Amino acid sequence: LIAVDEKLDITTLTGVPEEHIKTRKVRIFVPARNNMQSGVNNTKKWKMEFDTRERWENPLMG
Amino acid sequence: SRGEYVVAKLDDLVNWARRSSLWPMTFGLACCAVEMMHMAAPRYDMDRFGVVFRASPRQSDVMIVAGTLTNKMAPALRKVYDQMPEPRYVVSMGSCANGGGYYHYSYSVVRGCDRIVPVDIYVPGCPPTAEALLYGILQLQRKIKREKRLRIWYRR
Amino acid sequence: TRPTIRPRNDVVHKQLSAFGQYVAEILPKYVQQVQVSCFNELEIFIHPDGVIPVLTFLRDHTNAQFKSLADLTAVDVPTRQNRFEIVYNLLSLRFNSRIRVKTYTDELTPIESSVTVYKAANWYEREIWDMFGVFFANHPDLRRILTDYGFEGHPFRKDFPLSGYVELRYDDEVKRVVAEPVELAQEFRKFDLNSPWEAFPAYRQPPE
Amino acid sequence: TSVKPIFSRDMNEAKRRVRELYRAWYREVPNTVHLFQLDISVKQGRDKVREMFMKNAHVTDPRVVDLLVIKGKMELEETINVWKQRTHIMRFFHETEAPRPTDFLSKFYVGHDP
Amino acid sequence: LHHALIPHGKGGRSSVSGIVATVFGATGFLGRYVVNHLGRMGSQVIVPYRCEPYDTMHLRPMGDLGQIIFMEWNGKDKDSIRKVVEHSNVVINLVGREWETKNFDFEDVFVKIPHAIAQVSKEAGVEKLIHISHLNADIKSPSRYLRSKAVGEKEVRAAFPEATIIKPSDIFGREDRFLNYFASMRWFGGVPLISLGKETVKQPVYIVDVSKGIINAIKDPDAKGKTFAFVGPNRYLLFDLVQYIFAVAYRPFLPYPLPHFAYRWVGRLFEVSPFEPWTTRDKVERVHMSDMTLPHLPGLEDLGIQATPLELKAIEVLRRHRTYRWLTSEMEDVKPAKTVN
Amino acid sequence: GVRTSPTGEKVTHTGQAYDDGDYRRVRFSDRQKEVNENFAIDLIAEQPVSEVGSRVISCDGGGGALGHPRVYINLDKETKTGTCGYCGLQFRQPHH
Amino acid sequence: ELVQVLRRGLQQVSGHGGLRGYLRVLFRANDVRVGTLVGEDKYGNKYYEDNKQFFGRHRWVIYTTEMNGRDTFWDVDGSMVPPEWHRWLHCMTDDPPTTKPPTARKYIWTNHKFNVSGTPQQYVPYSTTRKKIQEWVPPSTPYK
Amino acid sequence: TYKFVNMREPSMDMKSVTDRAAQTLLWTELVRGLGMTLSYLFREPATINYPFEKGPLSPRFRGEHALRRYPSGEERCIACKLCEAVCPAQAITIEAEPRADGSRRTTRYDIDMTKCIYCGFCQEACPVDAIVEGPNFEFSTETHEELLYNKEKLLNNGDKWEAEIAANIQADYLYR
Ligand SMILES: COC1=C(OC)C(=O)C(C/C=C(\C)CC/C=C(/C)CC/C=C(\C)CC/C=C(\C)CC/C=C(\C)CC/C=C(\C)CC/C=C(\C)CC/C=C(\C)CC/C=C(\C)CCC=C(C)C)=C(C)C1=O
Ligand SMILES: CCCCCCCCCCCCCCCCC[C@@H](O)O[C@H](CO[C@H](O)CCCCCCCCCCCCCCC)COP(=O)(O)OCC[N+](C)(C)C
Ligand SMILES: CCCCCCCC/C=C/CCCCCCCC(=O)OC[C@H](COP(=O)(O)OCCN)OC(=O)CCCCCCC/C=C/CCCCCCCC
Ligand SMILES: CCCCCCCCCCCCCCCCCC(=O)OC[C@H](COP(=O)(O)OCCN)OC(=O)CCCCCCCCCCCCCCCCC
Ligand SMILES: NC(=O)C1=CN([C@@H]2O[C@H](COP(=O)(O)OP(=O)(O)OC[C@H]3O[C@@H](n4cnc5c(N)ncnc54)[C@H](OP(=O)(O)O)[C@@H]3O)[C@@H](O)[C@H]2O)C=CC1
Ligand code: SF4
Ligand code: SF4
Ligand code: SF4
Ligand SMILES: [Zn+2]
Structure with missing residues (x-):
């Protein structure tokens, strides 16, 4: 059983492109309760999501 | 003109042969291939129309892309299409071949065989019925009937 | 009569519980937990390095002849330290029973190959490696089985995008199929479906 | 915390495996160029092997290095056995990808990308 | 700019590049390459065609859904020309034949058609016009091809003063004439050369470089009314060039001097074919003629393209001409030809 | 009730019409633009108003299980008609 | 008896209106059967039924030689039938449109159309939604 | 029991x-x-004489799609997006806004027939029988774009096939 004094890092194994490894800022948060409902069952687990990027309109069918 | 009449008759003769002798390649990928078998079956006999399966791409005129085209399979499809000698035609059958189908948003599926090969006829359905595929074959025959290669060449 | 509710089999529940106690007593070194679900399925949670002894016992022991490996998969749960959960489904024809054995591992920790106990484990472990990145130590031939040649990334992980990062098309300039970054004519429309009202009180977790 | 080693124990054995894999890849490029009928040079192939080896030069975990050399051996055996086609070998070279700009002003001109 | 002409995306297949281009002569060699590059960018491309629709099939995969539009066209019909250039802000002209048919001459395809295309495009409000000419376009040139090239270049510049006239030297590629013309003389015994090809200097240019330069001419705002000269990086004698072609094709090279009048008569013999002739008198003259040097005109380095040497891309074209004994031979097995710089 | 744009292009019932300078009109050259001639708004306006002597009426669109969900419209406001919003059908009480 | 079969063949020859009618029905339909005339639509297509034949072959249609504006003497499509006769031919009902006419509405097409692919009447898609963002129009008058 | x-x-x-x-x-x-x-x-022989003879079908057959109308001419669809929600392949794109007369009606209703798997969930989920899968199955085109139906195309299909669609729904609506 070896011992490593290193921080875990698997970016080289995940296969993600370097652009989407480096230029991405995820947001760890607990979702806000939807004001339209009084239930609170969607505000119990943390979520991790990425920053929004560009969305354009398709020339055909829009 | 006499030359125009001769070329019109000659390219009507040539188009008739190609229309009336269609040899699809023995090439089926997924569940859409079963409906090709049912078109070959006695109920909708494709052999009536001069449509006969040949295994070798060198001896085929039509490639019926019937099933999901994956990333691991696209090179093989392009290779056999290239090995088919000209004139050659493509009939994409079913949603998976047409667009993406049920697997459009997948990491391992090519969204349409028209990204890989030039497709002449698109047959919708999941799977298209044997009658639908037969209608597509007849529509391909009517498309061949309009080709005027000698008529273009004479005026070229 | 309750025609819309599944009837329960307390006899089979008791039999499975007794056999779970039996195996837990026999192999205290590796077995960490034994559970019986209310639809009569026995589930054994072991230490990851007990795979070979536990599976060999369950295959060869006279009172547990699980001669058939029904399935072998893994589940990715990112919230755990050991995200990958390796699941073995065994079927005993002699006693007409089925059992489940679950272990855990992470990205960099190998799991001993069970091709020496069952021969289906060969392709099953190749698929597990291909789709999750889990490495199996003494595998006769470990390589990709399902993904494309040269494919980078393990698709079934939760952090892998649905459409991947590359897509294929034929480029006429270079006369071959090429791989280019993924670009969608219509983006996949993500739906938030979960209702904010708790459905099953029996599964409620403590507020902590 | 003691962790189960894949191979190589410490880092030196991992470097030894890396050198063995590099030799195996270096001696394979001429055969690959010959069999696949690639239009690239042997020097170009060796340079691409070197570049693909160098992009992982920042790894300091021996287990990550072991996994990297395992995957390298896999993709080497896909090439020796001609399981790969010319398509994949040339996919290594990104011959069709347009050069993305890298300076701030060009990135500002093209679009909204960071 | 119109709200639909603003670029969007990352320059992929499914992006919007804001370019709406009508490509005349898109059913040929340079045409297929230019259309491929435009569709790769993610532009809207209109392809006027006069041939059989079956002969335009290779252009279907080059663009996304709806990004390639095929329309019929005549060449003598200004109505058809307006129909195909009505909605496009870029018009590219690559129409031209190396020979003359019964219905079209060098005057028709190099002067009349480009002038009508430029005249209609000016009326329709097309912002950019790209016109492909030849490097050796001389009014007093021995070749009617080049005379008509020069006349049509002047007419296009007159009709559309804000044009970009591109003058490639001799484009080589998989579907070209140049390397294939020199490599197909195996069948006729030896290789006939005028003065043994020692008095001819040529610097061919690569097809991908030409297409990339055409694309960058559209995207450069400071190339509106200019003239470019697309040439390769090295100049070769005709003898050395043909010798290298045969070395790469691994065919026995047996050159012999053929007097100019004899070669002219031979070319006259081959141009009686109703189909595409193997060679013509004008083709013989153009092969014999040396490529002009135009240091004042800009080029690929000015449009941002580094010219690809012949020694890097010759094996793509000439591997097809090898036999089974020499198919697998590598690129570096043949020493590069002797240049004249 | 189709209408023609100043560029000669038919206008759909949703108001769609390509601008004069819009390049996307090229797709319709040598071909046609698919526009449905029947306008549902015009037809439902052409429909008459049914007078019933009750404060509340029920509409299911006709056909029963082949119509739409049955709804109840309150005919109390005398300044306007009560409209079933599934089928856009107007009802009124007998005035005067 | 072979004589009975030959007599039935001769009756089939005379059943299409002479030798010329027999040749026409043979060359453009590949069938020489004779059946009762169920009815005829407005486009010229004729529909026949014969319950003695096995299921699937008991109903058939002879297509017209000219539909709308296209000559269909040899180019006969499976989509040339109106919807009611389409239902009758595909056997979703046992009642012909003559016996049970369909419900008539003012929005239903009076003239049936076949597949218009490969013709100028083909369908071309477009976005049916208006422009999402309105851009600012600068003043046309000078300033300063 | 078993047998050898x-x-x-x-x-x-x-x-x-x-x-x-x-x-x-x-x-x-x-x-x-x-x-x-x-x-x-x-x-x-067991061969039918296609296209002059057709194989049997049923009122339940799922073919080309159509958008229906009320007998008064009003469109049945109310932009409720249940079909868009239930579509397995995400083939339906719907955008809506209040109409001039205040009705809840769609401005965009697209079905990508190259993405559709012809499963019939949309006509099951429709509360007003607006979207249906008609009896037509011979609608193969020569280009990919022609298979990207929009609201005008679907309304035309409904108006063209309304009689047969109504007959099929009448035949099979008691089993639903
Ligand atoms: C991909 O998964 C799969 C599918 O998909 C999803 C499927 O569907 C199916 C289902 C398919 C099957 C079950 C069968 C398909 C497989 C096969 C191997 C096909 C089987 C077919 C057969 C066994 C029978 C079909 C017939 C065949 C194959 C033969 C092909 C025909 C030819 C090659 C004909 C060409 C040769 C000719 C025409 C002869 C040459 C011409 C002449 C000699 C005429 C010349 C005459 C003259 C010169 C004389 C002229 C002069 C005259 C007249 C007089 C002149 C006189 C003077 C004096 C001038 C399967 C199994 C499947 O697995
Ligand atoms: C084999 C030895 C070499 C022979 C060399 C050629 C010898 C002559 C070949 C014989 C020619 C036969 C022509 C057959 C005519 C086509 C029959 C007819 O049905 O076609 C119609 C008309 O066909 C075309 O319009 C033209 C066909 C050819 C017309 C004559 C061309 C010139 C023939 C004379 C010159 C031959 C000698 C010169 C060359 C040596 C259209 O019908 P079609 O839509 O399809 O059928 C669909 C099936 N349906 C009806 C059930 C739906
Ligand atoms: C001229 C027209 C003739 C037409 C004949 C058509 C016959 C029907 C055609 C369909 C058959 C074609 C496909 C069948 C091909 C394969 C047939 C076949 O297998 O035959 C071989 C068959 C099978 O062998 P196995 O089962 O493998 O056993 C081997 C054990 N180690 O074996 C044979 O050799 C049979 C060949 C026929 C032998 C002839 C019979 C001999 C009888 C002798 C009596 C006469 C003696 C003469 C002396 C007279 C003294 C007074
Ligand atoms: C009573 C006296 C006699 C009367 C009859 C006389 C003629 C009988 C037939 C003789 C043989 C054919 C003669 C030549 C016909 C014209 C062919 C031709 O020139 O075609 C050129 C053209 C090529 O295409 P192009 O426009 O050049 O485009 C370049 C590519 N992008 O287009 C093509 O190449 C089209 C592809 C097919 C071309 C070959 C087939 C032409 C028709 C042949 C019919 C007979 C076939 C016999 C076969 C052998 C016997 C079984
Ligand atoms: N290729 C070269 O070596 C060089 C070429 N150039 C010039 O660049 C241009 C493009 O060259 P390239 O790609 O090789 O040309 P090609 O000969 O390969 O193709 C010519 C194109 O123009 C069309 N065309 C030809 N004649 C007519 C006509 N009368 N009416 C309408 N369309 C016609 C052809 O269509 P279709 O098949 O339907 O008839 C085809 O699309 C030409 O002007 C050429 O002179 C300049 C320098 C070098
Ligand atoms: S379109 Fe449907 S039936 Fe055809 S291959 Fe795809 S999933 Fe199978
Ligand atoms: S039939 Fe199924 S896949 Fe097709 S549009 Fe309806 S719900 Fe979607
Ligand atoms: S389910 Fe019916 S009413 Fe609702 S949006 Fe779809 S077609 Fe319209
Ligand atoms: Zn109502």
């Missing part, structure tokens, strides 16, 4: 041995197969 497919042994009496030897030397079972194929030759 092949566990019989042949008798070794002289008559049976001679019969087997005659079968070996005289190809009895081969002639039997020939006779079977000859019988099939003289039977009646």
Whole structure:
């Protein structure tokens, strides 16, 4: 059983492109309760999501 | 003109042969291939129309892309299409071949065989019925009937 | 009569519980937990390095002849330290029973190959490696089985995008199929479906 | 915390495996160029092997290095056995990808990308 | 700019590049390459065609859904020309034949058609016009091809003063004439050369470089009314060039001097074919003629393209001409030809 | 009730019409633009108003299980008609 | 008896209106059967039924030689039938449109159309939604 | 219970041995197969005369899509997006806004027929029977774009096939 004094890092194994490894800022948060409902069952687990990027309109069918 | 009449008759003769002798390649990928078998079956006999399966791409005129085209399979499809000698035609059958189908948003599926090969006829359905595929074959025959290669060449 | 509710089999529940106690007593070194679900399925949670002894016992022991490996998969749960959960489904024809054995591992920790106990484990472990990145130590031939040649990334992980990062098309300039970054004519429309009202009180977790 | 080693124990054995894999890849490029009928040079192939080896030069975990050399051996055996086609070998070279700009002003001109 | 002409995306297949281009002569060699590059960018491309629709099939995969539009066209019909250039802000002209048919001459395809295309495009409000000419376009040139090239270049510049006239030297590629013309003389015994090809200097240019330069001419705002000269990086004698072609094709090279009048008569013999002739008198003259040097005109380095040497891309074209004994031979097995710089 | 744009292009019932300078009109050259001639708004306006002597009426669109969900419209406001919003059908009480 | 079969063949020859009618029905339909005339639509297509034949072959249609504006003497499509006769031919009902006419509405097409692919009447898609963002129009008058 | 497919042994009496030897030397079972194929030759072929004859279909058949109207001419669809929600392949794109008269109606209703898997969930989820899967199945085109139906195309399909669609729905609406 070896011992490593290193921080875990698997970016080289995940296969993600370097652009989407480096230029991405995820947001760890607990979702806000939807004001339209009084239930609170969607505000119990943390979520991790990425920053929004560009969305354009398709020339055909829009 | 006499030359125009001769070329019109000659390219009507040539188009008739190609229309009336269609040899699809023995090439089926997924569940859409079963409906090709049912078109070959006695109920909708494709052999009536001069449509006969040949295994070798060198001896085929039509490639019926019937099933999901994956990333691991696209090179093989392009290779056999290239090995088919000209004139050659493509009939994409079913949603998976047409667009993406049920697997459009997948990491391992090519969204349409028209990204890989030039497709002449698109047959919708999941799977298209044997009658639908037969209608597509007849529509391909009517498309061949309009080709005027000698008529273009004479005026070229 | 309750025609819309599944009837329960307390006899089979008791039999499975007794056999779970039996195996837990026999192999205290590796077995960490034994559970019986209310639809009569026995589930054994072991230490990851007990795979070979536990599976060999369950295959060869006279009172547990699980001669058939029904399935072998893994589940990715990112919230755990050991995200990958390796699941073995065994079927005993002699006693007409089925059992489940679950272990855990992470990205960099190998799991001993069970091709020496069952021969289906060969392709099953190749698929597990291909789709999750889990490495199996003494595998006769470990390589990709399902993904494309040269494919980078393990698709079934939760952090892998649905459409991947590359897509294929034929480029006429270079006369071959090429791989280019993924670009969608219509983006996949993500739906938030979960209702904010708790459905099953029996599964409620403590507020902590 | 003691962790189960894949191979190589410490880092030196991992470097030894890396050198063995590099030799195996270096001696394979001429055969690959010959069999696949690639239009690239042997020097170009060796340079691409070197570049693909160098992009992982920042790894300091021996287990990550072991996994990297395992995957390298896999993709080497896909090439020796001609399981790969010319398509994949040339996919290594990104011959069709347009050069993305890298300076701030060009990135500002093209679009909204960071 | 119109709200639909603003670029969007990352320059992929499914992006919007804001370019709406009508490509005349898109059913040929340079045409297929230019259309491929435009569709790769993610532009809207209109392809006027006069041939059989079956002969335009290779252009279907080059663009996304709806990004390639095929329309019929005549060449003598200004109505058809307006129909195909009505909605496009870029018009590219690559129409031209190396020979003359019964219905079209060098005057028709190099002067009349480009002038009508430029005249209609000016009326329709097309912002950019790209016109492909030849490097050796001389009014007093021995070749009617080049005379008509020069006349049509002047007419296009007159009709559309804000044009970009591109003058490639001799484009080589998989579907070209140049390397294939020199490599197909195996069948006729030896290789006939005028003065043994020692008095001819040529610097061919690569097809991908030409297409990339055409694309960058559209995207450069400071190339509106200019003239470019697309040439390769090295100049070769005709003898050395043909010798290298045969070395790469691994065919026995047996050159012999053929007097100019004899070669002219031979070319006259081959141009009686109703189909595409193997060679013509004008083709013989153009092969014999040396490529002009135009240091004042800009080029690929000015449009941002580094010219690809012949020694890097010759094996793509000439591997097809090898036999089974020499198919697998590598690129570096043949020493590069002797240049004249 | 189709209408023609100043560029000669038919206008759909949703108001769609390509601008004069819009390049996307090229797709319709040598071909046609698919526009449905029947306008549902015009037809439902052409429909008459049914007078019933009750404060509340029920509409299911006709056909029963082949119509739409049955709804109840309150005919109390005398300044306007009560409209079933599934089928856009107007009802009124007998005035005067 | 072979004589009975030959007599039935001769009756089939005379059943299409002479030798010329027999040749026409043979060359453009590949069938020489004779059946009762169920009815005829407005486009010229004729529909026949014969319950003695096995299921699937008991109903058939002879297509017209000219539909709308296209000559269909040899180019006969499976989509040339109106919807009611389409239902009758595909056997979703046992009642012909003559016996049970369909419900008539003012929005239903009076003239049936076949597949218009490969013709100028083909369908071309477009976005049916208006422009999402309105851009600012600068003043046309000078300033300063 | 179980049965043995092949566990019989042949008798070794002289008559049976001679019969087997005659079968070996005289190809009895081969002639039997020939006779079977000859019988099939003289039977009646099972081929229909397409396109002049069509295979049977049912009122439940799922073919080309259509958007229906009320008998008054009003469109049935109310932009409720249940079909868009339930579509397995995400083939439906719907955008809506209040109409001029205040109705809840769609401005965009797209179905990508190259993405559709023809499963019929949309017509099950529709609360007003607006979207249906008509009886048409011969709608193959020559270009990919022609398979990207929009609201005008679907309304035209509904108006063209309304009689047959209404007949099928009347026939099969008591089973739903
Ligand atoms: C991909 O998964 C799969 C599918 O998909 C999903 C499927 O569907 C199916 C289902 C398919 C099957 C079950 C069968 C398909 C497989 C096959 C191998 C096909 C089987 C077909 C057959 C066994 C029978 C079909 C017939 C075949 C194949 C033969 C092909 C025909 C030819 C090659 C004909 C060409 C040769 C000709 C025409 C002869 C040459 C011409 C002449 C000699 C005429 C010349 C005459 C003259 C010159 C004389 C002229 C002069 C004259 C007249 C007079 C002049 C006189 C003077 C004096 C001038 C399967 C199994 C499947 O697995
Ligand atoms: C084999 C030895 C070499 C022979 C060399 C050629 C010898 C002559 C070949 C014989 C020619 C036969 C022509 C057959 C005519 C087509 C029959 C007819 O049905 O076609 C119609 C008309 O066909 C075309 O319009 C033209 C066909 C050819 C017309 C004559 C061309 C010139 C023939 C004379 C010159 C031959 C000698 C010169 C060359 C040596 C259209 O019908 P079609 O839509 O399809 O059928 C669809 C099936 N349906 C009806 C059930 C739906
Ligand atoms: C001229 C027209 C003739 C037409 C004949 C058509 C016959 C029907 C055609 C369909 C058959 C074609 C496909 C069948 C091909 C394969 C047939 C076949 O297998 O035959 C070989 C068959 C099978 O052998 P196995 O089962 O493998 O046993 C081997 C054990 N170690 O064995 C044979 O050799 C049979 C060949 C026929 C032998 C001839 C019979 C001998 C009888 C001799 C009596 C006469 C003696 C003469 C002396 C007279 C003294 C007075
Ligand atoms: C009573 C006296 C006699 C009367 C009859 C006389 C003629 C009989 C037939 C003789 C043989 C054919 C003669 C030549 C016909 C014209 C062919 C031709 O020139 O075609 C050129 C053209 C090529 O295409 P192009 O426009 O050049 O485009 C370049 C590619 N992008 O287009 C093509 O190449 C089209 C592809 C097919 C071309 C070959 C087939 C032409 C028709 C042949 C019919 C007979 C076939 C016999 C076969 C052998 C016997 C079984
Ligand atoms: N290729 C070269 O070596 C060089 C070429 N150039 C010039 O660049 C241009 C493009 O060259 P390239 O790609 O090789 O040309 P090609 O000969 O390969 O193709 C010519 C194109 O123009 C069309 N065309 C030809 N004649 C007519 C006509 N009368 N009416 C309408 N369309 C016609 C052809 O269509 P279709 O097949 O339907 O007839 C085809 O699309 C030409 O002007 C050429 O002179 C300049 C320098 C070098
Ligand atoms: S379109 Fe449907 S039936 Fe055809 S291959 Fe795809 S999933 Fe199978
Ligand atoms: S039939 Fe199924 S896949 Fe097709 S649009 Fe309806 S719900 Fe979607
Ligand atoms: S389910 Fe019916 S009413 Fe609702 S949006 Fe879809 S077609 Fe319209
Ligand atoms: Zn109502």
